[PDB]
Design a protein around this ligand. Sequence first.
Ligand SMILES: Nc1ncnc2c1ncn2[C@@H]1O[C@H](COP(=O)(O)OP(=O)(O)OC[C@H]2O[C@@H](O)[C@H](O)[C@@H]2O)[C@@H](O)[C@H]1O
Length: 166
Amino acid sequence: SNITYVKGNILKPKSYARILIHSCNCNGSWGGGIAYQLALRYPKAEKDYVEVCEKYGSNLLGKCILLPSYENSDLLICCLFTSSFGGSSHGEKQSILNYTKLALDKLKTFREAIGDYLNGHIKYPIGEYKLEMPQINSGIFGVPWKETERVLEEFSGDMSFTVYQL
Ligand SMILES: Nc1ncnc2c1ncn2[C@@H]1O[C@H](COP(=O)(O)OP(=O)(O)OC[C@H]2O[C@@H](O)[C@H](O)[C@@H]2O)[C@@H](O)[C@H]1O
């Protein structure tokens, strides 16, 4: 009910403000998949992500951080920390699903009021940003999308998501 599916590339530019949500490891590696593409296009955001990983490490599991893209004042990046390591070393799919839930709940709480890096680089009220994501967890982390979907649909009534399908 709160999910809208779009087929297309989430990184094609849009004219409206949005938060790009994606699933992250705590090892400072935007190393593959969508994270690699964000690293190529938003290197200052990658720097912030790496600094947060250096400061907190796997203590970040279940949290999210909102980062400026810096290249586009219409785009913020929301990192959901759902696994200690990336690539083949990722956590158990049950763990990733539960940290996704916990991280999205912190984002929900923030919008209703994570934002330390936004100070000075957020253009609009946080509620004005659309929440968009690829099919997170379903690639390098291997979690069947339908399981993450149930996590997304639990936030029905508080948050609406646009999910890009390639
Ligand atoms: N521009 C893109 N646009 C839309 N969808 C995309 C795009 N790039 C990838 N996708 C799709 O997004 C889904 C998830 O992408 P992954 O990168 O594999 O993310 P995830 O499964 O959640 O694993 C996260 C892990 O990999 C890295 O992204 C990250 O560093 C983390 O360690 C896959 O179906 C993938 O094909």
